Structures are given as structure tokens and as C-alpha cells.
């Protein structure tokens, strides 16, 4: 070892130490040896040579596979030096440095901190631009050892452009243990929502869901529990004709944790992009979502996204009429209204009324919505949500704004008031007093549909008498300059 | 709020009433139509559901000699063609 304690002989002495550190019963006293490891380390960084820098770190890996040489390198501090040799052009060094570091991140506490302190994060991400899948698979594992259970590290992976690299690792290679470790890394970088826009903006979600045929059941789930979170940015992304076809086909897979996930994406992906909510209508998804609510039952985690997705599909695009018709040709109108009845919670009921509102856009659905007993069930919840708001002054319980149930139910009664028979039901339930009591609501969205539902009722000459006997001479008069234009248009329409 | 550009035929309807943009939230499209048919008095005072767009520019966009406002889906189809889609 006195050898080590001496730029031409370390080329020699580090060879015979490389030789002595492959036999497990002959490498017992070469790791538990003081000065020998200390003299190395520094002659690795302060080196111009190659076979010196190769054979120097060339023994560090051989010292590092027993609970002795790992501590001898750490006690002699080589873990901040080996991250300098993470930019070495010598492909030998990167396979003698990264392979070494990966061993120091298995049975070595005190290295997880010293690797982030030295600066290996911004270094190991600059290494994920290789092609040797052995290098990609090992380094990606090291990034899942430093990111798991640490928030300060996930952000260092962000600025290092780490998100986009793992997307193109998915988008290119077919080696599973690479694509699985990458999926192991891509989740923990998406559970906190400061690390998510930069993933989809690099074309992320259309690359994670690029795995539809792959019998690696611990990988497809490792891609779907990612997209369920990253959904917040696909609201504007496009070019997902190959993901939606993948997702819409999975609304019938034998597992219940994919129906929960695949539907949880389509809702938060059709939310307001005119094409994707017109794409699942071009792949025949307007049906598969129905026969998904028919499959769930009293499982709110499935129906709520399967309704919100169906709510998004039945309004405000060109191919919306078939979305309103084909939901009843597949026998939805019975089960749709039967979600309003107990024990569904406020989140689903909010989405359920919103669907029926859009479902009443088609004329042919007016009566089967009436005959299935929907008009009373709307005011049955319109009264409870309204009289709850009042007893507070003149806020989110179970996740709903409560006052959205007022706009949602009154807005759904206003569409069905187009049918003349439904007006005998809407008036025949003593709701003209209530609709007038909503014209005073300080909220803008509640006054419109309330001033609009009376206008549909007032065109019946009989029903116009009651409204004027309600004290409706100032509400629909002071609203004649409403910046929200729709309030004044209907208010004057009732007045006349 | 949904942005989409009208084809040049319809783009002249909104220009001639008070607009100047190209990307319209698909409401002003209806809005400046609600002033193009209301200002020129193109309806029928007896039954104002009907719009007489005969010898006029509006008949060149929707075809048809006349129509009804309550024919919602028929008029919406007449929108998406004088409007940029894929």
C-alpha cells in the first residue's frame, strides 16, 4: 500500500488492486486498509491522462461491493469527486463512475445527502442522452433513489430538463427495465404540481400512453397512475389520436383500477378542447362511457369522471347532437336520473345535473327525461341547496360550491321548459315563487337562467299571471342594464 | 370561451357591424349576428321567429330563402362551415 502513498506507477499498482478485488475471499484486507484508498480519489480528478483516469476509478468500483470499501471511499470522501468524473468524455469513466455511484446508493446511508450536495443531479441528467441501455437503465435508477422521499431533489430534476428526457426515453427505447425505471421516476416527479406543466409541454402524455400492448402489468399501471395526475395540462395539448383510442378501448378492461384511471383522464382531457371531445365521438367513445356508468353502479370514483366526461361530450361542438341522442339509444336516461337519487354525494350530483342539462338540448330527449321522473328530482335538490345558502347571511361542503347546484338545477329546468308539457310540471310543483326568489341572488350566473326560465313560462298566458302576482316588477326591471348581457335580455322578455 | 376564425364570407358580416378581429370567442359570432339581423330589420314583425334573408348577404351564407331562429341545430350547422375547422 506504501505504493499508493507515493503518474506512471499508479497505472501499475491500480491494476494488481483491480485483480485482488475480484475474489471475495481474497479482497477482505484490501478494502479494510487505511491510506491506500485515500491516496487514490484525488489523483483521479487532478489528472490529464486517460489510462490513469481509467485505472484510477477502475479500482474504485472493485473496492465498492462489500460493506468495507464503500465506507472506505466515503470516510475518505470520494463521492463529491466522482461526480466531477460524470462529465468525462471517456466512456470508460462514465461506466466506472456511474456504476460505482450506483453501489454507493444501495447499502450506504450518508451518500444520498452527499450526492445532492456535490451536484450529481444536474450531472446525472446530462447523462441520459446516451444510447447504451445499460447506462440509461442504471442512471435512471439512481434518479429514482434520490427523488423518492425528497422535494428539494424533484425540483433540481426539473430545471435540469429532466422531465423531457424521460419522455423521450419512453418515446424511443423498448427495453422494459428502462421503461419501467423511467416510469418509476416519472411518477414521483408528478405528484407535486410544480413539476407537471414542463412534462406535458415536452409532449409527455402522448409518450407515456405509448404502451398499449406490453405484458408488463407493473408498467402499464406505472403509466396510467401518471397520466391521471398530469391531466391538468393536456387541456390544451393536441395530437392525441393514438392515446384516446388506447384509453377509450380500456373502458372495458377486466381490472377496475384502469376503468377508474382511463375515465379519470378523458374527463380532465375533454374539459374544453374542441377536438379531443370531438375525437372520442369519432372513435365511438360516446357509447363506451355510457356502458361504463352502467358497469359502475354505486361506485362514485368511476361514475363522477364517467359523467363529467359525458357532460363534456354533450355540449358546444359540431358533433354534439349524436352525443345527446346516442346516450339514450344505449339506455342511459333511466340510469342517469337514478344517480340524482341517494346515496350519491354532491360531486356526482353536480356533474349529473350538468349532463341532463346538456342532454335536454335534443328535443327527442325531452319526454324520456320527463317520464323517468327528473323534473321533481331537480327542484327536490334545487330547494335544499337554495335554502341552505340563505341561512348563512341574509363555502364547500363535500367539495361542492352548493350554489352551483342552484345554477345547475335552474339551468337544467330552463332547457326543459322549452317543452310545453314540462312547464305544467315546473309550474305544477309551485316553483314560480322560488324562481322569482332567485332573481335577487347576488350571483351573475343564477340570475340569467332564472330570468330565462320565467321567459319560457311566461309565453303561456296562464303562467304569466302568477309571476306578476309574485312581486316581479322590480327584479326583472333593475336587471335591464346587467353587464352580463343575458340577464337583461330575458328580464325585458318577461316584462313585455 | 372558444377561439376560432370565420371564413371570409362571414368575416364581412361582423366587420360591417362593428368588429375588426379575426379570432372570435364563439359568442360574438352570434352576438354581432344578433345585431346584423336586428339592425337591418330582416325578420317578420308578426312572427319574429322567422328571418327573411332573401335579397341580402345573409342568404349567401346559409343558403335557403328563409328560416326560423328556433331551428337551433340547423343554424349551428350553418356556422361551422363559415368557420375554420380541420
Amino acid at each position: 500500500t506504501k505504493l499508493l502513498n507515493d503518474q506512471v506507477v499508479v497505472n501499475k499498482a491500480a491494476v494488481m488492486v483491480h485483480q485482488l478485488s475480484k475474489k471475495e475471499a481474497s479482497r477482505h484486507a484490501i478494502m479494510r486498509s487505511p491510506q491506500m484508498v485515500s491516496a487514490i480519489v484525488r489523483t483521479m480528478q487532478n489528472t490529464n491522462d486517460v489510462e490513469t483516469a481509467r485505472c484510477t476509478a477502475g479500482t474504485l468500483h472493485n473496492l465498492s461491493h462489500h460493506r468495507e470499501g464503500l465506507l472506505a471511499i466515503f470516510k475518505s470522501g470520494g463521492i463529491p469527486a466522482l461526480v466531477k468524473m460524470l462529465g468525462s468524455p471517456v466512456d470508460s469513466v462514465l461506466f466506472y463512475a456511474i456504476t460505482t455511484l450506483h453501489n454507493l446508493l444501495l447499502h450506504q446511508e450518508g451518500a444520498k445527502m452527499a450526492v445532492r450536495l456535490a451536484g450529481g443531479l444536474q450531472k446525472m441528467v446530462a447523462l441520459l442522452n446516451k444510447t447504451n441501455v445499460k447506462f440509461l437503465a442504471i442512471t435512471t435508477d439512481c434518479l429514482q433513489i434520490l427523488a423518492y422521499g425528497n422535494q428539494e431533489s424533484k425540483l433540481i430534476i426539473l430545471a435540469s430538463g429532466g422531465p423531457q428526457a424521460l419522455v423521450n426515453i419512453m418515446r424511443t427505447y423498448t427495453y422494459e427495465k428502462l421503461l419501467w425505471t423511467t416510469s418509476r421516476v416519472l411518477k414521483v416527479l408528478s405528484v407535486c404540481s410544480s413539476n407537471k406543466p414542463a412534462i406535458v409541454e415536452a409532449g409527455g402524455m402522448q409518450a407515456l400512453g405509448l404502451h398499449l400492448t406490453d405484458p408488463s402489468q407493473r408498467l402499464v399501471q406505472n403509466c396510467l397512475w401518471t397520466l391521471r395526475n398530469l391531466s391538468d395540462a393536456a387541456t390544451k395539448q393536441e395530437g392525441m389520436e393514438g392515446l384516446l383510442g388506447t384509453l377509450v378501448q380500456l373502458l372495458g378492461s377486466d381490472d377496475i383500477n384502469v376503468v377508474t384511471c382511463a375515465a379519470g383522464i378523458l374527463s380532465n382531457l375533454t374539459c374544453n378542447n374542441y377536438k379531443n371531445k370531438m375525437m372520442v365521438c369519432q372513435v365511438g367513445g360516446i357509447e363506451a362511457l355510457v356502458r361504463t356508468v352502467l358497469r359502475a353502479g354505486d361506485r362514485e370514483d368511476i361514475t363522477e369522471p364517467a359523467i363529467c366526461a359525458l357532460r363534456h361530450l354533450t355540449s358546444r361542438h359540431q358533433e354534439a347532437e349524436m352525443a345527446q341522442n346516442a346516450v339514450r339509444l344505449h339506455y342511459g336516461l333511466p340510469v342517469v336520473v337514478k344517480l340524482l337519487h341517494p346515496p350519491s354525494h354532491w360531486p356526482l350530483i353536480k356533474a349529473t345535473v350538468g349532463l341532463i342539462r346538456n342532454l335536454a338540448l335534443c328535443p327527442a330527449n325531452h319526454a324520456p327525461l320527463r317520464e323517468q321522473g327528473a323534473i321533481p328530482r331537480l327542484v327536490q335538490l334545487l330547494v335544499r341547496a337554495h335554502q341552505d345558502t340563505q341561512r348563512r347571511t341574509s363555502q364547500f361542503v363535500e367539495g361542492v360550491r352548493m350554489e352551483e347546484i342552484v345554477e345547475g338545477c335552474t339551468g337544467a329546468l330552463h332547457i326543459l321548459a322549452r317543452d310545453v308539457h314540462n312547464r305544467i310540471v315546473i309550474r305544477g310543483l309551485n316553483t314560480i315563487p322560488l324562481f322569482v326568489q332567485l332573481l335577487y341572488s347576488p350571483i351573475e350566473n343564477i340570475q340569467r337562467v332564472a330570468a330565462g326560465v320565467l321567459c319560457e313560462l311566461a309565453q303561456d298566458k296562464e303562467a304569466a299571471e302568477a309571476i306578476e302576482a309574485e312581486g316581479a316588477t322590480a327584479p326583472l326591471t333593475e336587471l335591464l342594464h346587467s353587464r352580463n348581457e343575458g340577464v337583461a335580455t330575458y328580464a325585458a322578455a318577461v316584462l313585455f | 370561451e372558444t377561439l376560432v376564425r370565420p371564413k371570409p364570407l362571414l368575416l364581412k358580416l361582423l366587420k360591417s357591424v362593428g368588429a375588426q378581429k379575426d379570432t372570435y370567442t364563439m359568442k360574438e359570432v352570434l352576438f354581432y349576428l344578433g345585431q346584423y339581423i336586428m339592425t337591418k330589420r330582416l325578420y317578420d314583425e308578426k312572427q319574429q321567429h322567422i328571418v327573411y334573408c332573401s335579397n341580402d348577404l345573409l342568404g349567401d351564407l346559409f343558403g335557403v330563402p328563409s328560416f326560423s331562429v328556433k331551428e337551433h341545430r340547423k343554424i349551428y350547422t350553418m356556422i361551422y362551415r363559415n368557420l375554420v375547422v380541420v
Binding site: 355540449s315 358546444r316 330575458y490 | 321567429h49
Partner: peptide, 15 residues
């Protein structure tokens, strides 16, 4: 206003 009411009601399919 009979035209104003019906046309504003046409704009209710996009809201």
C-alpha cells in the same frame, strides 16, 4: 323583442 328573445335563446346552446 320576440326576435331578441328567441335569438338570445339560440345562444343558450353554447353556454
Amino acid at each position: 323583442i320576440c326576435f331578441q328573445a328567441a335569438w338570445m335563446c339560440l345562444a343558450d346552446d353554447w353556454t
